[PDB]
Amino acid sequence: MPHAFKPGDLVFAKMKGYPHWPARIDDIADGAVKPPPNKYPIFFFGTHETAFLGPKDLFPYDKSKDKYGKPNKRKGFNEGLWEIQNNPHASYS
């Protein structure tokens, strides 16, 4: 049975106006800005952008990849597919 989301989990993350996007739940570094309550820091692969999202926009990667893990025209998307498949826990700093 599923647990709550935790840093390191891989997802497709949904934002208004964008396709479901390969992403991870990030850690928050010491001294770094924390997310709002009930929100997680999402690191989007490919773009390497962060946004704060709740579980309603987070689709676990293993269950979702056959649907959402397909090339997309949008900038950064296909780089993002490579990252989540090939080195999803690397530093992209």
Curated annotation (Swiss-Prot):
Expression (tissue specificity): Widely expressed. High expression is found in heart, skeletal muscle, ovary and testis. Overexpression is frequently observed in hepatocellular carcinoma samples.
Subcellular location: Nucleus; Cytoplasm
Superkingdom to which the source organism belongs: Eukaryota
Domain PWWP: 7-64
Function field: Acts as an epigenetic regulator of myogenesis in cooperation with DPF3a (isoform 2 of DPF3/BAF45C). Associates with the BAF complex via its interaction with DPF3a and HDGFL2-DPF3a activate myogenic genes by increasing chromatin accessibility through recruitment of SMARCA4/BRG1/BAF190A (ATPase subunit of the BAF complex) to myogenic gene promoters. Promotes the repair of DNA double-strand breaks (DSBs) through the homologous recombination pathway by facilitating the recruitment of the DNA endonuclease RBBP8 to the DSBs.
SUBUNIT field: Interacts with HDGF. Interacts with trimethylated 'Lys-36' of histone H3 (H3K36me3). Interacts with trimethylated 'Lys-79' of histone H3 (H3K79me3), but has higher affinity for H3K36me3. Interacts with IWS1. Interacts with H2AX, POGZ, RBBP8 and CBX1. Interacts with histones H3K9me3, H3K27me3 and H3K36me2. Interacts with DPF3a (isoform 2 of DPF3/BAF45C). Interacts with SMARCA4/BRG1/BAF190A, SMARCC1/BAF155 and SMARCD1/BAF60A in a DPF3a-dependent manner.
Family: Belongs to the HDGF family.
Protein name: Hepatoma-derived growth factor-related protein 2
Organism: Homo sapiens
Residue range from the parent sequence: 1 to 93 of 671
